[PDB]
Design a protein around this motif. Sequence first.
Motif, PDB file in Angstrom:
ATOM      1  N   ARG E  64      -4.409 -41.746 -23.283  1.00  0.00           N
ATOM      2  CA  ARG E  64      -5.039 -41.688 -24.466  1.00  0.00           C
ATOM      3  C   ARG E  64      -4.267 -42.651 -26.030  1.00  0.00           C
ATOM      4  NH1 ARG E  64      -5.543 -37.245 -22.348  1.00  0.00           N
ATOM      5  NH2 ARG E  64      -7.394 -36.494 -20.822  1.00  0.00           N
ATOM      6  N   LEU E  77     -12.752 -48.823 -29.168  1.00  0.00           N
ATOM      7  CA  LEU E  77     -12.526 -47.539 -28.444  1.00  0.00           C
ATOM      8  C   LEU E  77     -11.653 -46.832 -29.277  1.00  0.00           C
ATOM      9  CD1 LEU E  77     -13.339 -45.395 -26.711  1.00  0.00           C
ATOM     10  CD2 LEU E  77     -12.629 -46.228 -24.184  1.00  0.00           C
ATOM     11  N   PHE E  79      -8.784 -43.053 -29.892  1.00  0.00           N
ATOM     12  CA  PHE E  79      -8.833 -41.652 -29.438  1.00  0.00           C
ATOM     13  C   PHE E  79      -7.384 -41.240 -30.349  1.00  0.00           C
ATOM     14  CE2 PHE E  79      -9.614 -41.911 -24.891  1.00  0.00           C
ATOM     15  CZ  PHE E  79     -10.377 -41.469 -24.627  1.00  0.00           C
ATOM     16  N   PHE E  99      -8.124 -34.843 -15.581  1.00  0.00           N
ATOM     17  CA  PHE E  99      -8.662 -34.108 -17.280  1.00  0.00           C
ATOM     18  C   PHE E  99      -9.124 -35.545 -17.620  1.00  0.00           C
ATOM     19  CE2 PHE E  99      -7.619 -29.959 -14.897  1.00  0.00           C
ATOM     20  CZ  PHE E  99      -8.877 -29.338 -14.939  1.00  0.00           C
ATOM     21  N   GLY E 100     -10.045 -34.944 -18.850  1.00  0.00           N
ATOM     22  CA  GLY E 100      -9.960 -35.972 -19.720  1.00  0.00           C
ATOM     23  C   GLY E 100     -10.976 -37.370 -19.268  1.00  0.00           C
ATOM     24  N   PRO E 101     -11.550 -38.064 -20.557  1.00  0.00           N
ATOM     25  CA  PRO E 101     -11.585 -39.684 -20.470  1.00  0.00           C
ATOM     26  C   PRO E 101     -10.737 -40.311 -19.543  1.00  0.00           C
ATOM     27  CG  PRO E 101     -11.759 -38.753 -22.451  1.00  0.00           C
ATOM     28  CD  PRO E 101     -11.785 -37.581 -21.849  1.00  0.00           C
ATOM     29  N   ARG E 104     -11.981 -47.836 -18.071  1.00  0.00           N
ATOM     30  CA  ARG E 104     -13.003 -48.988 -16.919  1.00  0.00           C
ATOM     31  C   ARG E 104     -12.083 -49.993 -17.459  1.00  0.00           C
ATOM     32  NH1 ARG E 104     -18.719 -48.810 -15.138  1.00  0.00           N
ATOM     33  NH2 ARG E 104     -18.619 -46.786 -15.749  1.00  0.00           N
ATOM     34  N   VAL E 119     -12.495 -36.660 -14.518  1.00  0.00           N
ATOM     35  CA  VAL E 119     -14.205 -36.316 -15.554  1.00  0.00           C
ATOM     36  C   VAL E 119     -14.956 -37.150 -15.358  1.00  0.00           C
ATOM     37  CG1 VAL E 119     -12.964 -33.794 -15.463  1.00  0.00           C
ATOM     38  CG2 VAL E 119     -13.607 -35.977 -18.459  1.00  0.00           C
ATOM     39  N   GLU E 120     -14.654 -38.475 -16.048  1.00  0.00           N
ATOM     40  CA  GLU E 120     -15.719 -39.413 -16.381  1.00  0.00           C
ATOM     41  C   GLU E 120     -14.591 -40.740 -16.887  1.00  0.00           C
ATOM     42  OE1 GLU E 120     -16.339 -41.470 -19.571  1.00  0.00           O
ATOM     43  OE2 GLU E 120     -15.700 -40.897 -20.285  1.00  0.00           O
ATOM     44  N   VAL E 121     -15.189 -42.299 -16.218  1.00  0.00           N
ATOM     45  CA  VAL E 121     -15.024 -43.182 -16.852  1.00  0.00           C
ATOM     46  C   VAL E 121     -15.444 -43.873 -18.055  1.00  0.00           C
ATOM     47  CG1 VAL E 121     -15.356 -44.307 -14.842  1.00  0.00           C
ATOM     48  CG2 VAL E 121     -13.838 -45.428 -15.790  1.00  0.00           C
ATOM     49  N   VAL E 122     -15.245 -44.401 -19.301  1.00  0.00           N
ATOM     50  CA  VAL E 122     -15.667 -44.904 -19.811  1.00  0.00           C
ATOM     51  C   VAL E 122     -16.122 -46.662 -19.089  1.00  0.00           C
ATOM     52  CG1 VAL E 122     -15.502 -45.798 -22.294  1.00  0.00           C
ATOM     53  CG2 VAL E 122     -14.252 -43.665 -21.556  1.00  0.00           C
TER      54      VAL E 122
END
Lengths: 56, 119, 229, 115, 122
Positions: E64, E77, E79, E99-101, E104, E119-122
């Motif tokens: 980030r 995008l 942060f 942890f944290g986005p 991709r 946790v997730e992928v953008v």
Amino acid sequence: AVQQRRSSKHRRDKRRSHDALTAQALSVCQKCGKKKLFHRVCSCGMYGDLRVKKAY
Amino acid sequence: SYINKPGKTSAWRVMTVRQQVSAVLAYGKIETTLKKAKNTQKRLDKLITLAKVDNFNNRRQVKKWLLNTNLFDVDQLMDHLFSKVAPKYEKTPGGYSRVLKLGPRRGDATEMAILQLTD
Amino acid sequence: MEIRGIFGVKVGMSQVFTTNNERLPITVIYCEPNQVAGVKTEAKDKYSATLLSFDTVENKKLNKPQQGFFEKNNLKPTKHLQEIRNMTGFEMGQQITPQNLFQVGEYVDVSAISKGRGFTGAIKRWNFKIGPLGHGAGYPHRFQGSVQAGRGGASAQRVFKGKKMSGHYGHEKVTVQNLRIVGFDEANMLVLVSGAIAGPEGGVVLIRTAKKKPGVVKPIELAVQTEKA
Amino acid sequence: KINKQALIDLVEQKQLKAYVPEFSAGDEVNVAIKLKEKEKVRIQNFTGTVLRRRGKGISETFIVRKTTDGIPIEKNFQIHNPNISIELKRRGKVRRAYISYMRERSGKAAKIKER
Amino acid sequence: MVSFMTRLNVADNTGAKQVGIIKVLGSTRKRYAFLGDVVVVSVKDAIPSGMVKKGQVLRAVIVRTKKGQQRKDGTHLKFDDNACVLIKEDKSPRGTRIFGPVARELRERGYNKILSLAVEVV
RNA sequence: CAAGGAACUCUGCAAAUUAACCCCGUAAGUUAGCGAGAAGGGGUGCUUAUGUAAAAGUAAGCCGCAGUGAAGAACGAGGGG
RNA sequence: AGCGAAAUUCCUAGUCGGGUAAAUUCCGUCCCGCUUGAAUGGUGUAACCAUCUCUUGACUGUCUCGGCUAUAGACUCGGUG
RNA sequence: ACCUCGAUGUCGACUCAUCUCAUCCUCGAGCUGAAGCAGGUUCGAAGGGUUCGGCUGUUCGCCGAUUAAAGAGAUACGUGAGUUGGGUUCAAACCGUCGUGAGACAGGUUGGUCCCUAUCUAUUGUGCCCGUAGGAAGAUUGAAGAGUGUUGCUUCUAGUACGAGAGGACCGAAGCGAGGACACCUCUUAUGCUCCAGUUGUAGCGCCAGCUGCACCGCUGGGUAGUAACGUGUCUAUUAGAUAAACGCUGAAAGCAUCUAAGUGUGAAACUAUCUCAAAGAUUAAUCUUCCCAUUUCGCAAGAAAGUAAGAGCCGUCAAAGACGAUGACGUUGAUAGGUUACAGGUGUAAGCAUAGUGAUAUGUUGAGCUGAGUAAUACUAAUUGCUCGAGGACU
């Protein structure tokens, strides 16, 4: 930033050769004398066809 | 540098414009510098158009661009403008006044010009 | 090589999306069908070129020599006459279309005038470096720095020719190459280009064939929105 | 010779969309985004409230903020980018359009919403 | 821009809490540290209860950026924080959980092992 | 004036977070005075009522993105000589 | 006596321990200390210094990285000069 | 001991850097105790580049990390009519010493100025008088120039040639890069000082509402145009020739042999052009095309009064331009600027009223109100019932 000598007369005259005033336009004043200058009030305390000025 | 005169500032110029439009509203003719006259002419046209609507909110708006005078107070000058100045210019889109170049100023050779009324 | 070109004016700059979800910055240039004043053949004027007359005006808005040579070639009253070297494809008095000059996805170059900044310091003119204002600097903060050429009795004691200095900046024509042509509009005489195109409102733009990319054409993608409700 | 500089929208007519609900900021919306992993188009939902709506016509940009794993994610989006699905979940009362005092707030504060 | 010895944080349980970029990996004078950049770092703070300690030099991947960057899609995008993840001399991570986005757009640059653990992928 | 946050420079030169009011709290050493305003923090608007001499103050509600809302504001910690 | 590479120490970029990825800067350690050192006072000393100095927090346009706006000068113009 | 001490600004740091190769890298190539990779040596080669931090005043020097590699010598060890005064050569005071002491230490500490209006050459852009061969408008070619001519990483052919195994290529292509230059204003930031606001206090608008002056542009939230970049886009060529080193062929010298003597070639980022830009004061004032004139009559008709009809200058509207000059459009049959109107744009439901409320307040009238500059129609005002120069072909 200082001069080591003075400036001669003739080189100064050549420098001053560029000294010249701009040419003022000439326009005819119909209702009164003293033909005026373009984009100026006419001679006679008036723009040219309309009188609204005085020379006070 | 050190202390000096601030010359001209945007607030100073707009205040001078307010004073001069107040004077011209009181009289109808102002002799000033060419630049000042041409700058004030646009705002004068805007004020005339806003006053020709004849709305009290417009009176409140034009209040913020006028300076008071003994001969013509704010209320007196506003009433005069709404009475006999505004109705004359509804038929004409803009161009309610004309500027004509006078001679130059003695002190600084500034291009003096007189701005006065037309239809 | 043979040069294909056209004149136009940058009327703005925007962005347009493409397929696979990426955007392409778009400079929009108004074009016009030029009327060829003349084609100068190597057997006619010792070198091939084409003088094009464009920006049509009124005949009363035209000079007597201009109207005389326009009626000599049976042309329209136009404002600007400019020559493009190495041009043989067309002849006198022929209207031109962008599709016959350029393709949809090839590479071409554009000559355009820069934004005139008037008197500009050498700092912005050559992207120089400015000194600091900390730990004691005095009046010089944005200054020439070192300019000594030669010290002593005689080492250089002079400033040589063409030192990078302040002066006129912009208001002059440069050229940018390898810019992807986007598309044309013959009904409204308009064109779209990618990248960054020089020129203020009413500026001059000349599109020519890229020297490094003479005929290479790439499949430029497009994006269209069909999501309305 | 005759110019209007309306051609900027004339070429832009083919990209403008009209479904867009009334939103500039202060409205809680979710955006569905189609992503092709060379196949198997996935749907990514990026909820939140819009902070800024700047631009003109096709140049209008709007920023959406989510708060996942404690980390705030701010992403700017265009109106007419393909593979995007827009909607409006809820809206409140708007006193000012541009907001940046939300890019730092915490939770346990339900934003003001109207019926 | 990005300063020399710029401080940033961790985004997974690797035993560290604060690190500082000591050199941008690659040819120097690049003076660019944006998202997805793998840069040489020195561990400013690492909890002794963790698996790593302070002072050691290694290489970490920033996740980030408080400035963010503009993307070729037209999306921007951005942060509000600067942080990174730490790799153990390979394309595999050290933290059991990430942890944290994450973005991709590093798919072509490997690190697919960490993408599923985030946790997730953008 | 973004992003860093002394990375420039021998060197935080210079700018620069803080102050004003209230509620707290405050280490070690001490030659008992200090230290120390330690540090570290939190709160400050309007309206309604209660407050007494006005209030300081209390509670309820109303807004803002903010309530020494604009003028003047304390930089800090540790060490050696 | 006391103390100590000490503003006093050439050996030195002393040794070591710490800081430091990186410290001819810094703090303590050993004592051949070329000339430390006891009213030229030796040794420390509590608080303080518009005292020298180091590490360091918040904070920043000192650095990336300058640019923007406002005026004043300049520039142009009338005068003085 | 040499010009110069009626002064020859000298240490260091930053900035301009430039030059040179006795080239560090990139490159071509030869040879090898050069299997490949990885090398070493050598010739050519300056087109391009050669990192950042901590310490000491520090280029010196040390250390750490990094890149294709992190060259060296020069310019008063360049650069104060550029900055710093940082240690070193200020006074002040002190430490240790020396000397009985005036003070000094080629020992040290504490701190301790950096004056300057550009006359000339020169340089950057820049206009002015002349003239380019009757007078103007242009179109120009280009003699002669300027800029650029950096480079690495991953993958495919390839675990392939090589090597044995292990290990590991040579070319080209694709992608990823760093660097700097130029250009840009749609995305992003910063400014956005006559844009939109919430907005406190004081003093006023005779009071409320609602405003004004000042308190940084009062504060704070944004932001149109515009300006910039921290935002975006191109660039790292290719080709032909001359070729260096080098590799050659034929071929004699000296019947062999032999890249050399003639001849015939290949071959380096160096060189020529090919790339980008300007360019005829380019005195060789070059070329072309068009336009205008030749109006009795008097010195070469030599202005003889009309001195262009082509157009330009003065003046103005101007801003795209704009230090000022200059560029460009327009000048009343004028669309040049301003004004008006319509649109946009963002700020953000304007005031007033009504409703609810005991009261801060909340909603409808309303995405309403507004807008320095964005887009365009209308002549509404000013760009005037204006002036001047501007040809009779110099000679064939």
